Amino acid sequence: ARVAVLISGTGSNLQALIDSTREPNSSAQIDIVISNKAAVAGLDKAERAGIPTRVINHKLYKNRVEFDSAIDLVLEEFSIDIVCLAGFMRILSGPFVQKWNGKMLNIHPSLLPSFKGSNAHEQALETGVTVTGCTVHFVAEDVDAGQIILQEAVPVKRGDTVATLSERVKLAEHKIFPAALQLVASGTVQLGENGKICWV
Numbered sequence: 001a002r003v004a005v006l007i008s009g010t011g012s013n014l015q016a017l018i019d020s021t022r023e024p025n026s027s028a029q030i031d032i033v034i035s036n037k038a039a040v041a042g043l044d045k046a047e048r049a050g051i052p053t054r055v056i057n058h059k060l061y062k063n064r065v066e067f068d069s070a071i072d073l074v075l076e077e078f079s080i081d082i083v084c085l086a087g088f089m090r091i092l093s094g095p096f097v098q099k100w101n102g103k104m105l106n107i108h109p110s111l112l113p114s115f116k117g118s119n120a121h122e123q124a125l126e127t128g129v130t131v132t133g134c135t136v137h138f139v140a141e142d143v144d145a146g147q148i149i150l151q152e153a154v155p156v157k158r159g160d161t162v163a164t165l166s167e168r169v170k171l172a173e174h175k176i177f178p179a180a181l182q183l184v185a186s187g188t189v190q191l192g193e194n195g196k197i198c199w200v
């Protein structure tokens, strides 16, 4: 299966996917990395790995639908089967999500359905949980509400900050995102017609 990875930043999840998809038994190959932001470290990681990159600046488009259409053009250019959102921080439009239904995965740094949104660690810390974690899910139109593929729990330590908690949770992200991508690329897991996850 041919994979696009979309990023907005550092790209540690991208790097874990590059490493995993290059193992001999990988059912996935990364053929393009797309960033909505220029000069982010994730682009360096892609280029060093010899993977093509495109920057599609969302600021340059009239609305969400036109931005998504620009992304979609590149996905078609590279005959992409599966999209991974790896630190990509834009909400996607309904028609784009619908087109890629069952083919697009996101990593989120909480145990969904807790702490949906763009500041999950801040929420976890404010709430005072002692266990958080991360989630890989299929992307649905409602943000962070799509069908869950894998999750991993991560303890919150007393005195944690966003810096220390995000560091600990990223170690788990780098485990489950490669595992989830392999499950979907191998056809082991799919989004069922009834909308629920199907292990074949």
Ligand SMILES: Nc1nc2[nH]c(CCCCc3csc(C(=O)N[C@@H](CCC(=O)O)C(=O)O)c3)cc2c(=O)[nH]1
Pocket (backbone or CB within 6 Å): 085, 088, 089, 090, 091, 092, 093, 094, 097, 106, 116, 117, 118, 138, 139, 140, 141, 142, 143, 144, 145, 146
């Ligand atoms: N339809 C849909 N789009 C998705 N995009 C992502 C990817 C993960 C999204 C996380 C996220 C949660 S809220 C937010 C946000 O408000 N973004 C802003 C801009 C944020 C920024 O640029 O810094 C926006 O899009 O206007 C970003 C996941 C996901 C999803 O499940 N469904």
Ligand SMILES: NCC(=O)N[C@@H]1O[C@H](COP(=O)([O-])[O-])[C@@H](O)[C@H]1O
Pocket (backbone or CB within 6 Å): 008, 009, 010, 011, 012, 013, 014, 042, 086, 087, 088, 106, 107, 108, 109, 117, 118, 119, 120, 166, 170, 173
């Ligand atoms: N999807 C919402 C969200 O908060 N995503 C989070 O952004 C970070 C990106 O790090 P990276 O650029 O090093 O992969 C990751 O922790 C990811 O779970």
